[PDB]
Symmetry: C10
């Protein structure tokens, strides 16, 4: 199991650590279909380019499962 | 073991956190075949375009499993 | 584990949440071979089109496993 | 993390069909005995494909057998 | 876990339900290398045909593992 | 877990069921590199033919793991 | 289970060992969409080049899951 | 779990069953990089031939893990 | 579970065995994005060459998970 | 679980069985980036050749995990 760090210590950490409520906010954005991911897309003859697509249903369902357990 | 956050705290959170009942609404839309996902589709010679398809049966069945356990 | 929501609360929810019996009806349709999924099919030279095919045996067997446990 | 169990009397009077335990095992048995088919895409040349039916694979028959062996 | 149904009830069922001994007979045929599966085989230029091949080693070893546990 | 059947009942079964010792004999043949599996091999331009190859190391190691636990 | 080393011993170690709070800072950067990974991208006719793409949604969701458990 | 058969019965079995110590000898040969597996190798234009390659690092590491647990 | 060898015996072993703290140092290098792996990269028409790429995000996240657990 | 064989019996075995300390030495070589594996590399038009590449990061991380648990 992951080491649990006091939420007061996460808050005063100079570099950002997400709190429990912020984890759920980010999972919520994914679950609501508001996020994108960068993937490689073919443009002809083996060549590819970077593009952004909506987060897949399998990843939204994983986010929903985690939200349902929280 | 996701941290469990009080539903009253989710409600007063400035940014949206999905509540338990809203998780089940979203899983229900998926299970009923009402949702789409964005995928890459070939259009010739290796080139692809973004398009929307129905959520696959494997993902609907995962939604149904989660609804059956809730 | 998924939060369990009272079936009375699912019923009065404004937006649809599937009840336990409705989960089993949808799994049953899959298991009986009555459902389809949308997939990409090649039509020549890398081009593809959307089409509907029967739900695969692996997904029917997963539906049957869930019905056997419910 | 277990499926809600519904009384078999309630399944029977449900308006829409819910498979009973014995009917689940009948459908797994058909698969296990090699009597079922699935629809797949088959190449017909140069990237073109067509829909066709093939026998259920051995991996899926073995999964049906495993489930029948546990029931 | 799968519901267990009385073997007397399986026997009187009009449609065939495999009994525990019959499951082990079918696994045994697979394990002994007596079974085939239908697969798609290339015949040139992306065209395919249906053919029968022996059940793979990975599937025989799964059958053997199950027989070893039964 | 798989239902474990009395070795006297396996013996009286009309059709053959592998006994515990016969399972370990077949696993041993695989582990010792004595078995083959049928696979599809390319012969040019997308065409394929059936041929026999030695059982892979991953499958031999699985056989060895099972023998080590028996 | 991984051997647990005293955080005082990690601190005086000559070579860097990440402390608990630093693990969470790195997971947070991933979860917030601030990190990249190096992958191979096609540039034509089977040739490829190295490029940087955003960390995928599946890996962000794993970082979020771990942060939710810490 | 696999049925455990008396090592005296393995020994008097007409056909060979590997004993515990022989399982570890075979795993050891794999771990030490002394074994090969047969694979299909391309020789041009989709044609392939059978050849032998060293057992992969993933399979050696699995052998090492099993030896470490025995 | 892996056989546990006394850390004093690991230290006097003629050939190197990594101690717990050294395992964590190496996981840390990975997690901090300091390591590379050798992969095959296409250079045209099916030919490939060996090159070094950064360790992927999935492997960094595994390192971070292990560090977070101990 | 693998049968546990007395280290005194491994030592007097005529054929080599790796002892616990020798398992850890081999895992250590892998973890330190000192080992190679044989793979197939394309040389043009579908033809391939055998070559040696560094063990991948995923396999190093598995070796490090195992060393961390020993």
């Amino acid at each position: 199991h992951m080491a649990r760090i006091d939420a007061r210590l996460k808050e005063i950490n100079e570099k950002k650590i997400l709190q429990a409520n912020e984890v759920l906010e980010h999972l919520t954005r994914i679950a609501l279909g508001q996020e994108k991911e960068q993937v490689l897309m073919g443009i002809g003859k083996g060549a590819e380019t970077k593009t952004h697509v909506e987060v897949s249903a399998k990843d939204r369902i994983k986010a929903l499962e985690l939200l349902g357990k929280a």
